[PDB]
Design a protein around this ligand. Structure first.
Ligand SMILES: [Zn+2]
Length: 258
């Protein structure tokens, strides 16, 4: 597959190789704040990252992933809409060419400059590859980024990007603390959806935080220096790696906050 975000292989084309692209639980979606209902059923959300062990950062030609050791229950997400325990496997971002676009989810049609996704798999399925085949297989924590003040906790990522400029490059990336990327409040919206890149599997419980984090213009300019291409190939800046909002269809978005 040769899917991307370019002029001729971008999201509007994905359905040809991945027909689930036009399915009933696709992501991202617009979050209409006036129609999302507070849900008293939601249990407290527990983001338990004290023991998180990062290993590596990789430019995969469509974003970069910070990868974690998920061989035991070290960094987990529980509670909220979730049943059981979800293990952190990687985080990545989606961002734009300019600050007025870049997020995948939108809030009353507002696009943010970027969106961070912390991806977790349901331990009841044993491994990630089994979990993505199940409707309750993954939990993705999405966090909006706006451009303002610098995020101290992001700077360790920013400073390694120069070393992974092109597709296929990786760098060691140990002792990174993902708690440094959280906003102050964990109020959220939740709905059932999908992976936002091919193969677009419909296996995700989305938990999208209402409070964005702030990053500096200098920080996001360094993201926009990455390349989609491999070493020595014609340079294509890694920008606008976001899928646009998809039809909500029958689904309800629930709010954790009154
Ligand atoms: Zn993502």
């Amino acid at each position: 597959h040769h899917w991307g975000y370019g002029k001729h292989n971008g999201p509007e084309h994905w359905h040809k190789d991945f027909p689930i692209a036009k399915g009933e639980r696709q992501s991202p979606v617009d979050i209409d704040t006036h129609t999302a209902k507070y849900d008293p059923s939601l249990k407290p959300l527990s983001v338990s990252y004290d023991q998180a062990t990062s290993l590596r950062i990789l430019n995969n030609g469509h974003a970069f992933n910070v990868e974690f050791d998920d061989s035991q229950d070290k960094a987990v997400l529980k509670g909220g809409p979730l049943d059981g325990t979800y293990r952190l496997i990687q985080f990545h971002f989606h961002w734009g060419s300019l600050d007025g676009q870049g997020s995948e989810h939108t809030v009353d049609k507002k696009k943010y400059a970027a969106e961070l996704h912390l991806v977790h798999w349901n331990t009841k399925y044993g491994d990630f590859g089994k979990a993505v085949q199940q409707p309750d297989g993954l939990a993705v924590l999405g966090i909006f980024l706006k451009v303002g003040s610098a995020k101290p906790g992001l700077q360790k990522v920013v400073d390694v990007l120069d070393s992974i400029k092109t597709k296929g490059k990786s760098a060691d990336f140990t002792n990174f603390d993902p708690r440094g990327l959280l906003p102050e409040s964990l109020d959220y919206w939740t709905y059932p959806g999908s992976l936002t890149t091919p193969p677009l599997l419909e296996c995700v419980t989305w938990i999208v935080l209402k409070e964005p984090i702030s990053v500096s213009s200098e920080q996001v300019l360094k993201f926009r220096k990455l390349n989609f291409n491999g070493e020595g190939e014609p340079e294509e800046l890694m920008v606008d790696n976001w899928r646009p909002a998809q039809p909500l269809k029958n689904r309800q978005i629930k709010a954790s906050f009154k």
